[PDB]
Amino acid sequence: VDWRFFGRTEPKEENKLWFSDKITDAYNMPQPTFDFRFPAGRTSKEAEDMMTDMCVMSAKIGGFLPGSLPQFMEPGLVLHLGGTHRMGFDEKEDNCCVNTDSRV
Amino acid sequence: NVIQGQLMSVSVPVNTLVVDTLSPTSWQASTFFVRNGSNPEQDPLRNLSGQA
Amino acid sequence: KYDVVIVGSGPIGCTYARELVGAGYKVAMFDIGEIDSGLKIGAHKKNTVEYQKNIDKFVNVIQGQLMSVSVPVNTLVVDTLSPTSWQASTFFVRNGSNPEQDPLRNLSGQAVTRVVGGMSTHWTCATPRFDREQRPLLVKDDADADDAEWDRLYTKAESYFQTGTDQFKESIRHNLVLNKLTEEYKGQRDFQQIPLAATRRSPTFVEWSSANTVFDLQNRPNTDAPEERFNLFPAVACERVVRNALNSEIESLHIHDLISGDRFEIKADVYVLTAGAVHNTQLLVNSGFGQLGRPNPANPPELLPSLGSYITEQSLVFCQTVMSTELIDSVKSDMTIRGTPGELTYSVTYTPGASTNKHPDWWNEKVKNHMMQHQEDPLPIPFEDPEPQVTTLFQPSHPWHTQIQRDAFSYGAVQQSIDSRLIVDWRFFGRTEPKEENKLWFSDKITDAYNMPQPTFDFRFPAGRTSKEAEDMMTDMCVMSAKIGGFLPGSLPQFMEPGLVLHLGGTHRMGFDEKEDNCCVNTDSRVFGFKNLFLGGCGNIPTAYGANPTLTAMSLAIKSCEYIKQNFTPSPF
Amino acid sequence: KYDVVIVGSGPIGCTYARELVGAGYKVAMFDIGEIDSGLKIGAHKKNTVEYQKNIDKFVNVIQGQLMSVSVPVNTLVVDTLSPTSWQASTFFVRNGSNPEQDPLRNLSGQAVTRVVGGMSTHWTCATPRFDREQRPLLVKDDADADDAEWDRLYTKAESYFQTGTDQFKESIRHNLVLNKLTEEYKGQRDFQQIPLAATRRSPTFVEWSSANTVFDLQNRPNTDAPEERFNLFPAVACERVVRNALNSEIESLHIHDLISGDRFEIKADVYVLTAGAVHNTQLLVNSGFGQLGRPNPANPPELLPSLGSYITEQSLVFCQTVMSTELIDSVKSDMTIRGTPGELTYSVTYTPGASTNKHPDWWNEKVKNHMMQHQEDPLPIPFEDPEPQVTTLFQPSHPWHTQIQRDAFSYGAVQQSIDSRLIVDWRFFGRTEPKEENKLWFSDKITDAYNMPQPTFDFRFPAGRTSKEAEDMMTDMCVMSAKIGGFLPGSLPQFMEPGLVLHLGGTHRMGFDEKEDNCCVNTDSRVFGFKNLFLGGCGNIPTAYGANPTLTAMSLAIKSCEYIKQNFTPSPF
Ligand SMILES: *Cc1cc2c(cc1C)nc1c(=O)[nH]c(=O)nc-1n2C[C@H](O)[C@H](O)[C@H](O)COP(=O)(O)OP(=O)(O)OC[C@H]1O[C@@H](n2cnc3c(N)ncnc32)[C@H](O)[C@@H]1O
Ligand SMILES: *Cc1cc2c(cc1C)nc1c(=O)[nH]c(=O)nc-1n2C[C@H](O)[C@H](O)[C@H](O)COP(=O)(O)OP(=O)(O)OC[C@H]1O[C@@H](n2cnc3c(N)ncnc32)[C@H](O)[C@@H]1O
């Protein structure tokens, strides 16, 4: 049995996806670059509490499989990236890019 | 394998792993230079290395 | 001819030596292994200046002297050989494997050490007492008297080992870990330093105890002990104790000198076997106790039917953690920190004696000095900080022993990327119910490297409580360790191979009545029916225990020595 | 105050001790390391009965005492940590790494051993002579006289080491390998047993030589040597030799007692440094020879400008093979074999003395007995067969040393599937041209675990001949080994990490003229300009060599002792 537990990440202004003005990708487009750390506070506290929850819960079904012991996966392997062009009611007030009609 | 076959990494930092078991006749650079499609802008410690 | 012969120069044999040499007996001691620890015979191998400056190297020394007890026949397929290479058509018995061994009913991790001083040349030195729930009875039907007997014996044992609980009191990391854990358990689990057989000599050097601490193993008489009589004979395999016909006395010991190759017999009044849990059993079975060969429930042994049954070994779980931001920041919580490290304006200061300080001035001085003198280093932990040595001892509500430390460890290339000061080891040790079906037996056909009957395990962790607790123990380590930091990749929470822990007991177990308690020795460690044969070691322990057993084994050995002293007279000098 | 002080108790220090104690000098010897080899001080650690019954365990003992010289700063990314774990924002200097070390210009495999007896406590004991093409000149402009000098010195060195070439003559596997290789090379390469410093005591036990063989390291005078004077002082770090102003004499040696922590100075007439290739250099640079810090071509050292330059280390390639069907079948070529193993009609017979037999009766007896008494075993090789010990020595046409053996090896789980009798190790060792740009230097800021200037390598294998030969050497091992069997998966042909081989030379090299030969010592191993300072060890070797260097180092040390004997008078007893 596989266990995958997925945590929530607070949006923080310092967490960015930006694009190189010099370097390009395979399609000659500006090369994507991440400036990302999991926020301190709630996000990190919950992530570790989440790991513990999976250890506790999974023990009810059986022991860990060697070679697949409890672990954090590499950041962004999960592919659930959001907030790169985020929605809100007011551009300035909600620090966002699109409205609730997804209109820029 | 099908999943792995179509996930292309977004930003790969410059690799700095030391391989010092090469033959003396093999060419080797004196630095860990930007290679193999790595992104030289990418700080390896502030990445989403798994993003694809 | 001697008064007493002791087989094995481990810390339990040395306990007998210490007591009986001191009492004026003419003692001989034999060990199959050799003197290979320095001029302090049987001393701890980690007590060199060079090891304590390169501590992770010591794991190699441990590995170098753990020889696997029973290896099953290997059936791994290698089909990438060249076509010209020879290959058998079957997975035949090879490379010292034991063909009697079922690979799925083994203690694959069980190993033995054959060197003077035994495993005490390399052990971790943790010497906790067993609480009542883990401990065999020495007095029946009076718990107070039983507690008093145990307290007196353990106190003497702690004396011999030089057990202390204060040698790591000035470690920042020790404190950091202990102080956090004790805050998080609501007063319902107590955390202390692991009781350690060790004496600190300086802030960077600890003299770990060993067999040598217990008894120095020098031949006597000598200048320091002109009226004592002791000889030690290394590289002598003890092969057989010779039973009389009535099974009431041992009459000699057969030995094989490994150097000359000659075989002798040695006469003593008293024979003590302290060859370890595995090798005590083997020597007994080779002498006609229990039985050789696959055991049959139809045909039980007539002599010591319980020998080699009810064996126990602990479940062991392990991980490492990387210390949390919260804890690293707390190290420096009392400091005012201004500027950027390495720049002209950088400073780290504290106010001595301030009441709002979390830490005493000794801590703050060390941290401030480290931070100001090593501005290239981003951690507040000083460089020669002693390692954490933390436990919460076994209790009914958490019936497992715990050790939270930073022991010698061979980090992989990627783990070595993590600063060692951040790394904490977790080892949790479970207790195993004694079950008659769990056995150590010996082949009637196959022999080991010393031409002795080959040991074979028939072991599974008992169903019920033992297995339920082991898994609850794994969970406890996941929960507890999360309070200090996340898991270190490559050292994620795992069960270790059965018997890697080396806390095997019950192979020649103690009780009040041979039949009623299904046992082999009485509370004097005397073999039932025999006037003059005693066994010492963890194999005597008949109970389900989680804590490290050597101190308890030693305590039983002191009691056994008292019996010998009360009943056998030393020969005249 | 002593006549002679020797720094280091390795086999080269013991050579000086042997010669000079014997000649009647009052000798002191210091070693930073401790006595930890048994009561035979400085003896080979593989000389226990237990290791020779469990030989693959000995690799752990070697690993346990090789401390890396210079480790670069690690920059491996671990990004699978929990978010609560502390992490630095940079790959900062940690875990004892050397921040001066360029990771791409290192000898990452270089390590040192600090124990009494040095590396001779664990070495492989191969003691070949160097042919002319590898060997420094002791006499200029007369090759015959040079050859005579070398023959006399090597002969004495072989005596001290107890070097032999016959101790493995009855190994089936030795023969199987040697006899095949010599048939396949058309008479143009000669194969012999590796000359080994060792004395066989029985068919399953070899007493490997060490420093102890050379000099027993017991204090004198003693009962065996009432008129000799020697003291050995372990756990003493030798820190500095004190130069006079004219750089013509050493005036004292500063020492640090590691146990008490006190620092002393010791006066002698003669100072000999035998602390190894790395640590001789370090002790000299700490005493003001050469220079501390990153070297500058602008600003060369005024004292011993060649110290720490022209360093050489060998290229080393390795694989293992699994013995071919052709060779395994040849073992039993003289046998008539009828029936199926384990069945009533199975038999294996030969005709003694038959002329058409390929093998002598001693071989055929062993094989027939093995095959008939172990019918469960599919191989014709007896179980306690000694290991192969085969070489073809360096020659102009194949300028690399070779060793074809079966040494201690920690096989992975899958390799352990292959019967050990089938497995053969290949190690080929190349020669490295001395180049001025190849350096060992010492940090002016960073210190090692003993508070001494931190060693740093600036090394690449020279372009040209050295690199061309190394790759030709790899190819030679692929070609040669294929004659015996295919490669063992997990041990495929590979270059080992630079300096793992531990045959570093040229760090304080010998020659006739300091300026002309770019060197540090003369052919008496005397430091140029100094009346009373001598260096011993592989660091003296100035040439490109492939063969194992210790015997050659020892030969130079005997010559140095002769000079000391001719020029310094022992003090009166
Ligand atoms: C391996 C080790 C063990 C250890 C541990 C960590 C490791 C890496 N840490 C421990 C700790 O923190 N606390 C604790 O209580 N125990 C720890 N251990 C285990 C401990 O070392 C053993 O429990 C203890 O050493 C047992 O003592 P004992 O004296 O009973 O047995 P021994 O040390 O194994 O020595 C027995 C000897 O007798 C010899 N021998 C064996 N067979 C023969 C024969 N046939 N003839 C003559 N002599 C024999 C051995 O060679 C040996 O020295
Ligand atoms: C590691 C080993 C080495 C070895 C080998 C296999 C391995 C696994 N096999 C070899 C073989 O088959 N043939 C051969 O010729 N060499 C082999 N080697 C290498 C060999 O062991 C060395 O070449 C030899 O031991 C060198 O001898 P030497 O006497 O020059 O040096 P040493 O053995 O390193 O001992 C030097 C000692 O001095 C000490 N020390 C170091 N620093 C100090 C200071 N500051 N003060 C006082 N003492 C110092 C050491 O502790 C040491 O014992």
From TrEMBL, chains C, D:
Pfam families reported in the protein's UniProt record: GMC_oxred_C
Catalytic activity line of the entry: D-glucose + O2 = 2-dehydro-D-glucose + H2O2
Known cofactor(s): FAD
EC number from the UniProt entry: 1.1.3.10
GO cellular component: periplasmic space
Domain of life from the UniProt record: Eukaryota
Alphabetical UniProt keywords: FAD, Flavoprotein, Nucleotide-binding, Oxidoreductase, Periplasm
Molecular functions per Gene Ontology: flavin adenine dinucleotide binding; pyranose oxidase activity
Family assignment from sequence similarity: Belongs to the GMC oxidoreductase family.
Record-linked PANTHER family: PYRANOSE 2-OXIDASE
Protein name: Pyranose 2-oxidase
Species whose genome carries this gene: Trametes ochracea
Gene: p2o
